[PDB]
Symmetry: D2
Subunit: 249 residues, 4 copies
């Protein structure tokens, strides 16, 4: 079993890669910083179980992995963009097109690049990492919440055509997952150290804590194992019960 | 009260434009065919209570309506694109982009173009016509279902920020709505006439029939009326109960 | 067209009755207080357009209305119970059975009592008034949120069998609808006068205000008019955008 | 780690009990047939790693497990009732009550009976097995679909208060899961053997097959493991993609 995890330094990247690899997948990793050989080889050295790739674009990346490693069994599309908290009327149309490019077009392109090989052998798994923002409580996140919805609905829709070929498709919609040094989307500073951030979390999530990288990695790996292919199409709300609101004053 | 309905000859266009008009709104209309003065004039003669514009892109359409009728109270973004049933590996990436542009970037642009003047007047209603295909039963409809889902979520997201400025936002997600001569998406031929289509509609929908332009128009007109602003954010599933098994 | 509205003094009762009647329905009204003729006739006097009934139980009530007025076209099941904000382990099983009796069994019994006459003439509308609590943000409302869900799912399920008979079925799930002198569920004191209650509302709803009885009545009446039978099965979230949560600290 | 699985011979019972056991939980089992020492003993011989109880009602079942194995870490409320396809006007009101009691009051009672000891230990997992029939495509299933929806919402509601005490709550809503000899709800005869059933499953579900007890059991065991507590509140749609059109 060979896996691709994208943007491996951010968001759900490391949880996914590290846990897939503990389980025994062979894990090829994409990141933007891997443009640079200095960065690539420092990651390889830091994590000798993982296989970093330099390729950046979807068709590029799939083919390199296929040639180097024989075929792609598991695709984890771990998509990122910075959130821009503007009122609607202060965006340009181009800003949404960029957001949609990074969050919705991307996972479609990776799924387009890899499907035919997966269909041909009647096996594969496909996992999009999206966001609990999809139909959520926030305001002034309109470009971000909607693009994430497009992505979650894509996974569900793909699940229905790819069933005949024995290929499960899933979407994982997180909130409040600790991201360590990564700014996407809950870095340990400030979320783990600033007393207000710590309090906001305790207020508004049912479990009263951040979720861990391990919990997200454990999920990606459960879905990829083939123990429960029958859940195909599921959007998973990986949000620790967020939001909760307290009883009336 | 001034309204804009886009792509007026297709999908929920006529339903929406005609009902708004009966209700006393001044309804400006957009459509691709109004590029051609020829077609525009034919429309205006047939529909003296509607006012068809030639303008095609969102900002010029909004500016032109604003300048000739003096402020948009109501936007109905009636969005359409040719659905092509294909398996995921047979599409060009560029085909998804085109489909997202017509079904998803376009309602954003129209909202983006009208939002600041509605906030200033603290008054307005915004309606996206999307689709019941979002998270639906279909296969090989992946581009369409997902683009339409993006558009529905956009309506919900905007309702949340625009509430504060007294501006309700809605999506209407149809299936099986009669589109007359238009092929977007259930044209009278064949859906009303071919025995085998009539029976498919009768089997997989609860009311056992197609929805009408009057039903669609009546919903748009109620939403826009100011009578039930407190539904803001809602996705209405206009599908007569589809599917049934 | 003849309508029944239940518990007419509470919740969505008056909005429903008054607006149905403005539209030209003949409106028969049920309330618990109508047990007492003193209360009945004061309501009749106060509102001469409306027809109060004394009957309390579903079979009882339907038959009286049918005999007095010829047939029932529109059923508005406007169901109430006091919410009890306990932790789960502090309920008795009986407390949930009571809640389920008042919120879920009741609307089923009224729909059971009236269906056959509606099926026979191939016309009718059925409206349950439930609650946005159904899958909501609250805690320690567990008996209340779930019973309301049972009721909303009932409406949807009934819509699918009653389509062949041209009978639309809907569920209206409110939050924060001003209820005047009624304690179910947002009385004007304190919600309209106490500065904290007013503030909580501004914090957490998108429109930053209570919803009105008129807005709810306008909806029941729109659905009953037959202008848009094609929405059958809809659960309407009549909650003014609740909940919203502010940007990160 | 101690678990309880109810109605163990039906629906998701064996899936759940057997997988939990393989994972090192001590699994107590309940079932109507364990009224009769006869049947209980036959079960215990066949399944030496499972421990069947005779107790029938929620509080005695919980007390008896607590006293013989010393604290319930895991509740799996595997709920069942005979579905009778009838139109709304043909049911007795009392038939809805019975259906609500078995599918909805029962998981409440079991949760109600175990919650305080889990809060004290700040440790526990609670899983309801419900149904994909909630807001589904079926007609004349009104009592069943609604009772199951009540049960699913109960899981979500409890997750919200029990979070604070470190106790995750879940529902699993199945369709088309092989139930072996059990008639709740897809027995091997006929669903595995009759040509016409095999083809219906093949047509209306995306994976074109029935789910297995191993798949169900693997989900329960993952949820209960402590590995992904942050999903708490989730309704898992275990339906292989049903329906498709
Ligand atoms: C705008 C706040 O961010 C989120 O909603 C969640 C984020 O997208 C994913 C995580 N963790
Ligand atoms: C427990 C708080 O009450 C609600 O959720 C809304 C209420 O049930 C209906 C209204 N208005
Ligand atoms: Cl349509
Ligand atoms: Cl099942």
């Amino acid at each position: 079993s060979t896996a691709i995890v994208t943007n491996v330094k951010h968001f759900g990247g490391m949880g996914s890669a590290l846990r897939l690899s503990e389980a025994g997948h062979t894990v090829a990793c994409h990141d933007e910083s891997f443009k640079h050989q200095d960065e690539l080889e420092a990651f390889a050295e830091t994590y000798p179980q993982l296989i970093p790739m330099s390729e950046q674009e979807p068709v590029e990346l799939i083919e390199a992995v296929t040639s180097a490693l024989g075929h792609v069994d598991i695709l984890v599309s771990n998509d990122i963009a910075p959130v821009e908290w503007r009122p609607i009327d202060k965006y340009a149309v181009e800003d949404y097109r960029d957001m949609v490019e990074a969050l919705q077009i991307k996972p479609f392109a990776l799924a387009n690049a890899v499907a035919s090989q997966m269909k041909r052998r009647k096996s594969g798994h496909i996992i999009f990492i999206t966001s609990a923002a999809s139909f959520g409580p926030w305001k002034e996140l309109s470009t971000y919440a909607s693009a994430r919805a497009g992505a979650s609905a894509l996974a569900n829709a793909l699940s229905k055509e790819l069933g005949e070929h024995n290929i499960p498709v899933f979407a994982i919609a997180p909130n409040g997952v600790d991201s360590g040094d990564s700014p996407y989307y809950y870095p340990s500073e400030p979320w783990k150290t600033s007393p207000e951030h710590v309090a906001w979390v305790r207020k508004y999530t049912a479990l009263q804590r951040l979720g861990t990288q391990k919990e997200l990695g454990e999920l990606v790996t459960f879905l990829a194992s083939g123990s429960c292919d029958y859940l195909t199409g599921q959007v998973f709300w990986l949000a620790g019960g967020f939001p909760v609101v307290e009883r009336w004053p």
